[PDB]
Design a protein around this ligand. Sequence first.
Ligand SMILES: [O-]S(O)(O)c1ccc(-c2c3nc(c(-c4ccc(S([O-])(O)O)cc4)c4ccc([nH]4)c(-c4ccc(S([O-])(O)O)cc4)c4nc(c(-c5ccc(S([O-])(O)O)cc5)c5ccc2[nH]5)C=C4)C=C3)cc1
Ligand SMILES: [O-]S(O)(O)c1ccc(-c2c3nc(c(-c4ccc(S([O-])(O)O)cc4)c4ccc([nH]4)c(-c4ccc(S([O-])(O)O)cc4)c4nc(c(-c5ccc(S([O-])(O)O)cc5)c5ccc2[nH]5)C=C4)C=C3)cc1
Ligand SMILES: [O-]S(O)(O)c1ccc(-c2c3nc(c(-c4ccc(S([O-])(O)O)cc4)c4ccc([nH]4)c(-c4ccc(S([O-])(O)O)cc4)c4nc(c(-c5ccc(S([O-])(O)O)cc5)c5ccc2[nH]5)C=C4)C=C3)cc1
Ligand SMILES: [O-]S(O)(O)c1ccc(-c2c3nc(c(-c4ccc(S([O-])(O)O)cc4)c4ccc([nH]4)c(-c4ccc(S([O-])(O)O)cc4)c4nc(c(-c5ccc(S([O-])(O)O)cc5)c5ccc2[nH]5)C=C4)C=C3)cc1
Ligand SMILES: [O-]S(O)(O)c1ccc(-c2c3nc(c(-c4ccc(S([O-])(O)O)cc4)c4ccc([nH]4)c(-c4ccc(S([O-])(O)O)cc4)c4nc(c(-c5ccc(S([O-])(O)O)cc5)c5ccc2[nH]5)C=C4)C=C3)cc1
Ligand SMILES: [O-]S(O)(O)c1ccc(-c2c3nc(c(-c4ccc(S([O-])(O)O)cc4)c4ccc([nH]4)c(-c4ccc(S([O-])(O)O)cc4)c4nc(c(-c5ccc(S([O-])(O)O)cc5)c5ccc2[nH]5)C=C4)C=C3)cc1
Ligand SMILES: [O-]S(O)(O)c1ccc(-c2c3nc(c(-c4ccc(S([O-])(O)O)cc4)c4ccc([nH]4)c(-c4ccc(S([O-])(O)O)cc4)c4nc(c(-c5ccc(S([O-])(O)O)cc5)c5ccc2[nH]5)C=C4)C=C3)cc1
Ligand SMILES: [O-]S(O)(O)c1ccc(-c2c3nc(c(-c4ccc(S([O-])(O)O)cc4)c4ccc([nH]4)c(-c4ccc(S([O-])(O)O)cc4)c4nc(c(-c5ccc(S([O-])(O)O)cc5)c5ccc2[nH]5)C=C4)C=C3)cc1
Ligand SMILES: [O-]S(O)(O)c1ccc(-c2c3nc(c(-c4ccc(S([O-])(O)O)cc4)c4ccc([nH]4)c(-c4ccc(S([O-])(O)O)cc4)c4nc(c(-c5ccc(S([O-])(O)O)cc5)c5ccc2[nH]5)C=C4)C=C3)cc1
Ligand SMILES: OC[C@H]1O[C@@H](O[C@H]2[C@H](O)[C@@H](O)[C@H](O)O[C@@H]2CO)[C@H](O)[C@@H](O)[C@H]1O
Ligand SMILES: OC[C@H]1O[C@@H](O[C@H]2[C@H](O)[C@@H](O)[C@H](O)O[C@@H]2CO)[C@H](O)[C@@H](O)[C@H]1O
Ligand SMILES: [Ca+2]
Ligand SMILES: [Ca+2]
Ligand SMILES: [Ca+2]
Ligand SMILES: [Ca+2]
Ligand SMILES: [Mn+2]
Ligand SMILES: [Mn+2]
Ligand SMILES: [Mn+2]
Ligand SMILES: [Mn+2]
Lengths: 232, 232, 232, 232
Amino acid sequence: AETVSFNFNSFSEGNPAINFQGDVTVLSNGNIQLTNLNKVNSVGRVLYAMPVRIWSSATGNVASFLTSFSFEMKDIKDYDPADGIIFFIAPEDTQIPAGSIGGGTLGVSDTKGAGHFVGVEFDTYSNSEYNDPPTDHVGIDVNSVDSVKTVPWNSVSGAVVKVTVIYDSSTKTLSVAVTNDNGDITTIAQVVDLKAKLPERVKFGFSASGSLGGRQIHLIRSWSFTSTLITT
Amino acid sequence: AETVSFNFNSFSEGNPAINFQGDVTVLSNGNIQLTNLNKVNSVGRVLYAMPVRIWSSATGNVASFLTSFSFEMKDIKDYDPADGIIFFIAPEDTQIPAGSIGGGTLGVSDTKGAGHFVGVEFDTYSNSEYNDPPTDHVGIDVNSVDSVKTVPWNSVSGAVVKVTVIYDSSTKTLSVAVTNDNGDITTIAQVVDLKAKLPERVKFGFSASGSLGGRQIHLIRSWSFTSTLITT
Amino acid sequence: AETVSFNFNSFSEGNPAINFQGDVTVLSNGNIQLTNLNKVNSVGRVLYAMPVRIWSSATGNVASFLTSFSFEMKDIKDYDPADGIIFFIAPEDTQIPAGSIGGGTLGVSDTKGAGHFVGVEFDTYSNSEYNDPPTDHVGIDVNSVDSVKTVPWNSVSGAVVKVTVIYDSSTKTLSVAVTNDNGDITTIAQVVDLKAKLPERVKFGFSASGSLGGRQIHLIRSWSFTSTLITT
Amino acid sequence: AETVSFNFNSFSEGNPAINFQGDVTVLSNGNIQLTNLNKVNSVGRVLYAMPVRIWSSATGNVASFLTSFSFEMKDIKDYDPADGIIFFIAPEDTQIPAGSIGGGTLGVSDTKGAGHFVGVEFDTYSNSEYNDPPTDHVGIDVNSVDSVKTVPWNSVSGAVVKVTVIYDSSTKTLSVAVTNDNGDITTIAQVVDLKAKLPERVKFGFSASGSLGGRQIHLIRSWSFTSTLITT
Ligand SMILES: [O-]S(O)(O)c1ccc(-c2c3nc(c(-c4ccc(S([O-])(O)O)cc4)c4ccc([nH]4)c(-c4ccc(S([O-])(O)O)cc4)c4nc(c(-c5ccc(S([O-])(O)O)cc5)c5ccc2[nH]5)C=C4)C=C3)cc1
Ligand SMILES: [O-]S(O)(O)c1ccc(-c2c3nc(c(-c4ccc(S([O-])(O)O)cc4)c4ccc([nH]4)c(-c4ccc(S([O-])(O)O)cc4)c4nc(c(-c5ccc(S([O-])(O)O)cc5)c5ccc2[nH]5)C=C4)C=C3)cc1
Ligand SMILES: [O-]S(O)(O)c1ccc(-c2c3nc(c(-c4ccc(S([O-])(O)O)cc4)c4ccc([nH]4)c(-c4ccc(S([O-])(O)O)cc4)c4nc(c(-c5ccc(S([O-])(O)O)cc5)c5ccc2[nH]5)C=C4)C=C3)cc1
Ligand SMILES: [O-]S(O)(O)c1ccc(-c2c3nc(c(-c4ccc(S([O-])(O)O)cc4)c4ccc([nH]4)c(-c4ccc(S([O-])(O)O)cc4)c4nc(c(-c5ccc(S([O-])(O)O)cc5)c5ccc2[nH]5)C=C4)C=C3)cc1
Ligand SMILES: [O-]S(O)(O)c1ccc(-c2c3nc(c(-c4ccc(S([O-])(O)O)cc4)c4ccc([nH]4)c(-c4ccc(S([O-])(O)O)cc4)c4nc(c(-c5ccc(S([O-])(O)O)cc5)c5ccc2[nH]5)C=C4)C=C3)cc1
Ligand SMILES: [O-]S(O)(O)c1ccc(-c2c3nc(c(-c4ccc(S([O-])(O)O)cc4)c4ccc([nH]4)c(-c4ccc(S([O-])(O)O)cc4)c4nc(c(-c5ccc(S([O-])(O)O)cc5)c5ccc2[nH]5)C=C4)C=C3)cc1
Ligand SMILES: [O-]S(O)(O)c1ccc(-c2c3nc(c(-c4ccc(S([O-])(O)O)cc4)c4ccc([nH]4)c(-c4ccc(S([O-])(O)O)cc4)c4nc(c(-c5ccc(S([O-])(O)O)cc5)c5ccc2[nH]5)C=C4)C=C3)cc1
Ligand SMILES: [O-]S(O)(O)c1ccc(-c2c3nc(c(-c4ccc(S([O-])(O)O)cc4)c4ccc([nH]4)c(-c4ccc(S([O-])(O)O)cc4)c4nc(c(-c5ccc(S([O-])(O)O)cc5)c5ccc2[nH]5)C=C4)C=C3)cc1
Ligand SMILES: [O-]S(O)(O)c1ccc(-c2c3nc(c(-c4ccc(S([O-])(O)O)cc4)c4ccc([nH]4)c(-c4ccc(S([O-])(O)O)cc4)c4nc(c(-c5ccc(S([O-])(O)O)cc5)c5ccc2[nH]5)C=C4)C=C3)cc1
Ligand SMILES: OC[C@H]1O[C@@H](O[C@H]2[C@H](O)[C@@H](O)[C@H](O)O[C@@H]2CO)[C@H](O)[C@@H](O)[C@H]1O
Ligand SMILES: OC[C@H]1O[C@@H](O[C@H]2[C@H](O)[C@@H](O)[C@H](O)O[C@@H]2CO)[C@H](O)[C@@H](O)[C@H]1O
Ligand SMILES: [Ca+2]
Ligand SMILES: [Ca+2]
Ligand SMILES: [Ca+2]
Ligand SMILES: [Ca+2]
Ligand SMILES: [Mn+2]
Ligand SMILES: [Mn+2]
Ligand SMILES: [Mn+2]
Ligand SMILES: [Mn+2]
């Protein structure tokens, strides 16, 4: 088979394996701070430098992958806790949308919240302009921040969250498991046809944004990944 | 919410948190050995002592759970590697099935292969008698050792395996992810209405079995489980 | 190591994790009410279903635990505020003591005040019969409602109390810390060889009681416990 | 009674309630980083600005106090993970020891490892000059980094540790509970007569340190404190 795997217990802004886009910045403790606190419409993104072949136009096969990461969101005084983080998969040439308003677009969509990407957002602000549920939530996005599905969730300031994703090729079922601070788990699943919505060669990564009045600390602590494509 | 969460990195007899049914023997290194090598038809199971209420006849809700565990199956000179391990869910009153012999009921069914439980199997020996695919496989059993679905897997002697399982309360999707020694990941997923096959209170555990000519060591090295039942 | 850890921010009947002995009634708001207000000699207890092995006859070791919980005791027109709540440890086979009447056995002892258990009491009514200090107090009981040690405390109707308990495996020191509504903290500590007073397997819970003339509401709002038993 | 209490969920540089002594620095996410990864014998300390009256001259009374905090230590490449963190209590005019060598001294002792303070160290480097145990440990210090008592412990790089301390005046008992990322809890208690080892007015705080090759990320994330002195 064709297997891809990596593991980051910490980061550094000189590692060739990571692509930094936007106001991204690496802290002294090894964490990645996606957005700039005192910047209007801040947008930061981070992608694994190397492109993962998730499916073969040849065989007709699709890869299965298991990844898990942990992040932290914290409130900053006088500023609305927004907008959130999103784990995304996109074509290898993915860029921050030209003139991106930031905020509710999470840095992977245009003003009408559209774009070419599949992702799991950890939304902390309700954008009626995107059909956002009235409360914090977790969602499965498929080429739009107007989630195909969401599940109520609760963002605790300054608490480390742990996430475990699984994509089973056979069923094209993307399943998420989120371990909240109080021990409680939150799950959400959706059937997404990756071959159908993305190219053979893509890229994974994290993005986060905010507005002028909406800002908060977005930190990625660790990230491990392993994809496996059957070649037969 | 109502959440159950335990974690075992080692084991030891006498712990009130675990019930040992069968030829289960705890090694002097905190490892659980499921079957007796010197017996014909050995059978052993390890269960988490307390019944966990997976769904509520009142809420109508069904819990989601995130459980991951590791095991090892080493071969033994002049013996067919069998029958394999199995992670399962059963009615709180679950008694250990009748030991059988040439058989491979994985310790959860009768000679015919029937039984009241739902589980993920890591089978290493084919039995025309239960539709066992030609080779080693990972399956999804629902009241029968004749898996509902199966996927090609390969068991490697003396290799430690890591397994992450996720269950989505809504989508009723059971998603497994097998991480092998070399790195490659195997995954399978299936819908199983837990509220349709199991009583409100069930029990989680691992089971194994052997035959007259099929035997091997079945080691459960670690186990961590977490389930959350929304009720409101 | 061998660790037990649960967490309840709310309660609900039917949860297999908790056993209800006596006049325990679960409110429609996830709160536990220990005594019945319309009964003479009400008595109620709530216990964590599974027995926790506090010490090993093999290791000689004794587990340490960190448990914290919150409660509330509101008065009721024309009634003496009593008897108080109590956090205790008992032999796994613990039955609920005989309901008594003028009495104040806190639901863990006989008419005389004897019983097999060890606990921290939050007593709000003096009984010359058991040496109750002149006023409200927090005590450390060891097989007797006649506290081994006591410290002046003051119970305030309708106030939510936070309590953090720590037990050191070695020093055999049980240390309580009562946080009142206004802020002030009350603390008491006592050596109690858990391995000397209790059998290997015990049970943790909260108990309460009332009299003919003494009654009040006893609410257990939340509970989080964690114990670790070193074994190697 | 006289009670002192505060609570921090994140710190800031321009906060007169906190005294920053040494290589201290406050990250963008509100955490405090006690040492500088680039200096040689980097020493950092942070004290609560206002002094606390732990014992009354008039009345041979001493205060009880409850406090809990969480930290994170991480390994930095090419440097030994050292030296650790310490929660200390010192006279209100306390400073960094003249010409401190940092390292084994944890920034609160001279070269012989002596000074004026009562602390709880989370040691990560075995120094034979201070009779350190051979493994990571938690210790109780009384005017010397040569612990009056210690307990084996394990520091995990990048993991959030939660700590809870309780000091009972009546017993002059100091008990700690450390909650590892693991879920496991480590404990350690010691009887320290504060009035006998410290001045009426003290200051509480944290500290960390490193050497030439011994360096790591030391971070304080939160800190809550309450102390109540009886005055009758
Ligand atoms: O007549 S026989 O019976 O004998 C017989 C002859 C040939 C075959 C082979 C074959 N491919 C081989 C290699 C190979 C492997 C190793 C070595 S070696 O190790 O070096 O020796 C040498 C050669 C090989 C290497 C790369 C590819 N094949 C790639 C490919 C290209 C580009 C990319 S890309 O874009 O990513 O660069 C990605 C993948 C493709 N192959 C197909 C394809 C196909 C499927 C469906 C449809 S359709 O029906 O239309 O859907 C259309 C086309 C077929 C159909 C038959 C077939 N490939 C599509 C893409 C070796 C044999 C089988 C039997
Ligand atoms: O009749 S006979 O008995 O005579 C007989 C004749 C031919 C065959 C073979 C064959 N493939 C071989 C290699 C091979 C192995 C080792 C070496 S060696 O190392 O040199 O030894 C050299 C060559 C080989 C290597 C790689 C591939 N084949 C790849 C492939 C390409 C790209 C990728 S990827 O992932 O990189 O993109 C992954 C996989 C493919 N092969 C097919 C394919 C096919 C399937 C379905 C459909 S259909 O359903 O109709 O669409 C259309 C086509 C067939 C059908 C028959 C067939 N391949 C599709 C992809 C060797 C033999 C078997 C029996
Ligand atoms: O009937 S016969 O005469 O035919 C006959 C049948 C079977 C046996 C064997 C046997 N083990 C073998 C290997 C082996 C050797 C060489 C190769 S080869 O070189 O590759 O060929 C391959 C395999 C082998 C390899 C590893 C082990 N055995 C391990 C083990 C597992 C896991 C770990 S771990 O955890 O560290 O990973 C560490 C160690 C154990 N084995 C026991 C054990 C046992 C003891 C006491 C109790 S009790 O009663 O409860 O006290 C319960 C169970 C028995 C009982 C019988 C028995 N093992 C416990 C642990 C080969 C044969 C002997 C005779
Ligand atoms: O229900 S199930 O389907 O699950 C099922 C459950 C159990 C069984 C088996 C069984 N024995 C086997 C072998 C075996 C055969 C072939 C190979 S192989 O060749 O490798 O294939 C490997 C192993 C096997 C080999 C040797 C023996 N059994 C010997 C024995 C040992 C030593 C000597 S001696 O004296 O010579 O040393 C003499 C005899 C005995 N076996 C019994 C015995 C018994 C007799 C009377 C009474 S009672 O009435 O109470 O008195 C009580 C019990 C039973 C009862 C059941 C039973 N044996 C008594 C002695 C294989 C299976 C089968 C099916
Ligand atoms: O026999 S008699 O006739 O004599 C008789 C004896 C006792 C009662 C009372 C009673 N409540 C009172 C106050 C009260 C009265 C007067 C003053 S005064 O004005 O000062 O005098 C002050 C306070 C009072 C105040 C607040 C509440 N009660 C709240 C409550 C609190 C918080 C929240 S929350 O979540 O919003 O925080 C939500 C709800 C609840 N009360 C119930 C409840 C219940 C219903 C169904 C189910 S079940 O079917 O099982 O589901 C379970 C439980 C009952 C059942 C009987 C009953 N309450 C559930 C919630 C006073 C009397 C009635 C008649
Ligand atoms: O026999 S007699 O005639 O003498 C007689 C004796 C006792 C009673 C009372 C009583 N409650 C009173 C107050 C009260 C009123 C005014 C003041 S005053 O203003 O100070 O004067 C002070 C105090 C009072 C205040 C708050 C409550 N009661 C709350 C409550 C709990 C929790 C919360 S909260 O928010 O924490 O959740 C909020 C509210 C509850 N009360 C019940 C309850 C109950 C119902 C069903 C079931 S069951 O069997 O299960 O169906 C079990 C239990 C009963 C049953 C009898 C009863 N309450 C459940 C919740 C005053 C009297 C009436 C008559
Ligand atoms: O073991 S312990 O020590 O714990 C202990 C446990 C229980 C008891 C009590 C008790 N009753 C009390 C009051 C009371 C007194 C004073 C005040 S106060 O003054 O306010 O303080 C407050 C409350 C009290 C008031 C009214 C009644 N009791 C009424 C009653 C109600 C209504 C009417 S009516 O018809 O007029 O409406 C008529 C009679 C009855 N009581 C019984 C009865 C019984 C009789 C025969 C049979 S059997 O032989 O089996 O058939 C079965 C049961 C028993 C058995 C035990 C018992 N009552 C039958 C009717 C106070 C305590 C004492 C000690
Ligand atoms: O017999 S009579 O009935 O006539 C009678 C007369 C006097 C007393 C009082 C008393 N103190 C009062 C205040 C007070 C309170 C409120 C207000 S008001 O609210 O303003 O009105 C006004 C005044 C008061 C305020 C501050 C102090 N007292 C301080 C003090 C000073 C400095 C500090 S410091 O360091 O923090 O600055 C800390 C503490 C001390 N007081 C003693 C002390 C003592 C104990 C043991 C020993 S020994 O045996 O040697 O051990 C030596 C000394 C005694 C002994 C008796 C006594 N104090 C030691 C320190 C009010 C009355 C009782 C009975
Ligand atoms: O004749 S009678 O019998 O009738 C009789 C006469 C006098 C007394 C009183 C009394 N103190 C009062 C206040 C008071 C209360 C409220 C207000 S109000 O608010 O205005 O109303 C105003 C004043 C009062 C306030 C503060 C103190 N007293 C403090 C004190 C100071 C500083 C601190 S601290 O912590 O801040 O440093 C903490 C505590 C102390 N008081 C003593 C003390 C003592 C103990 C042991 C020893 S010995 O063992 O011998 O050494 C020697 C001395 C005594 C002995 C008797 C006595 N105090 C030691 C410290 C009011 C009355 C009682 C009965
Ligand atoms: O409040 C956070 C929220 O802001 C929205 O945009 C606001 C903008 O922040 C505010 O300054 C302006 O006056 O009105 C805008 C429209 O509500 C973002 O659109 C949303 O995504 C959050 O970031
Ligand atoms: O190894 C960490 C350890 O260092 C000790 O000091 C060393 C110093 O780090 C090294 O660079 C120098 O060459 O020798 C010194 C003497 O051992 C510290 O004393 C100790 O506390 C740790 O920080
Ligand atoms: Ca949003
Ligand atoms: Ca089989
Ligand atoms: Ca009492
Ligand atoms: Ca040291
Ligand atoms: Mn959304
Ligand atoms: Mn099978
Ligand atoms: Mn008492
Ligand atoms: Mn030390």
